[PDB]
C-alpha cells in the first residue's frame, strides 16, 4: 500500500546512503570476524609487542596506553566525518536550523559510534583500521588505569546489542532515528525534528517487520537500547573528564573538544 511504500523508499534511500557514507559495513565486518571472507585476515594485537609489530598494517599519524587512546581519537574523528555525511542524506535534515543540525550531531555522534562499533566487536575483540587489525578485549582491559576501563563498557553494550542480529539495512534507519532526537539539550525548534523522527520510526518499524518477520518487536527492544546508549556516553564523558585531568602529556583532537565541551 502507498503509505508502506513511501516508508520502503525511505528505508532504501537511507540504506544506499549508509553504504556510501561508511566504508566498513556490518556485512563485511562479520565476514572478517568469521573468516568467511577469502580476503587477507586482520593482524591480531594482544600485547605490547604485537602492537609494535602491527604499526605496519595500521596508521598512528609516548607510552602505550596514551598511544592506543590517541588511536581511538582518530577512529572517532573519522566516524564523526562519516556520520556527518550520512546525516546530510537524511531527508529534511539539512533544511533544519543549522544550530539544531550541530546540536543533533553533537549529542548523536557518540551514540552512533558505539552502535556501529558493536558491528566491529565480538566478546573477544574489535576490528580496527577498516578490519585490517583485530585488538583483543583482554589487551584493552590490561592497559593501566584509567585507560584499562575505557573500552569495556562498549564491549558490554556490544554483546547485548549484537543479539538482535540487525543488518546494515536496519542499522541505517536506527542510526537516523538516533540523530533526529527531539529531546537533546538546547534544541531551538523541536517540532520539525520530531516530525522527521516520527517518519524514520515508522520506516524502522516497517523495516523490522519485513527484514525479520520470524522476529517479533525486534522494534520494541531496539528503542529500549537507545537509553543504554546515552549511559555509555554519560559514563564515557566522565571517564574523558578523569583522563583529561589525571594526564597532562596529551590533548584531545579539536573536533572531539567541540563535541565534548558543554556535554553532560
Amino acid at each position: 500500500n502507498p503509505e508502506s511504500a513511501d516508508l520502503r523508499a525511505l528505508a532504501k534511500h537511507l540504506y544506499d546512503s549508509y553504504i556510501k557514507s561508511f566504508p566498513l559495513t556490518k556485512a563485511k565486518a562479520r565476514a572478517i570476524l568469521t573468516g568467511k571472507t577469502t580476503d587477507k585476515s586482520p593482524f591480531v594485537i594482544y600485547d605490547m609487542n604485537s602492537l609494535m609489530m602491527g604499526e605496519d598494517k595500521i596508521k598512528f599519524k609516548k607510552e602505550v596506553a596514551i598511544r592506543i587512546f590517541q588511536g581511538c581519537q582518530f577512529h572517532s574523528v573519522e566516524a564523526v566525518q562519516e556520520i556527518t555525511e550520512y546525516a546530510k542524506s537524511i531527508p529534511g535534515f539539512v533544511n533544519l536550523d543549522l544550530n539544531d543540525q550541530v546540536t543533533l550531531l553533537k549529542y548523536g555522534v557518540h551514540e552512533i559510534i558505539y552502535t556501529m562499533l558493536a558491528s566491529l566487536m565480538n566478546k573477544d575483540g574489535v576490528l580496527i583500521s577498516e578490519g585490517q587489525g583485530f585488538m583483543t578485549r583482554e589487551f584493552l582491559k590490561s592497559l593501566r588505569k584509567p585507560f584499562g576501563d575505557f573500552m569495556e563498557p562498549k564491549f558490554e553494550f556490544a554483546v547485548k546489542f549484537n543479539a538482535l542480529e540487525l543488518d546494515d539495512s536496519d542499522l541505517a534507519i536506527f542510526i537516523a532515528v538516533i540523530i533526529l532526537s527531539g529531546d537533546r539539550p538546547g534544541l531551538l525548534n523541536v517540532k520539525p525534528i520530531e516530525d522527521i523522527q516520527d517518519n524514520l520510526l515508522q520506516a524502522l518499524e516497517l523495516q523490522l517487520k519485513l527484514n525479520h518477520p520470524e522476529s517479533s518487536q525486534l522494534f520494541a527492544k531496539l528503542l529500549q537500547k537507545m537509553t543504554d546508549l546515552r549511559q555509555i556516553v554519560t559514563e564515557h564523558v566522565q571517564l574523558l573528564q578523569v583522563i583529561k585531568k589525571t594526564e597532562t602529556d596529551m590533548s584531545l583532537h579539536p573536533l572531539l573538544q567541540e563535541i565534548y565541551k558543554d556535554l553532560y
Binding site: V102, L105, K106, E258
Partner: peptide, 11 residues
C-alpha cells in the same frame, strides 16, 4: 563555536 562541525556540515 563548533567551527569544525559547521565546516563539516557546510562543506
Amino acid at each position: 563555536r563548533h567551527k569544525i562541525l559547521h565546516r563539516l556540515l557546510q562543506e
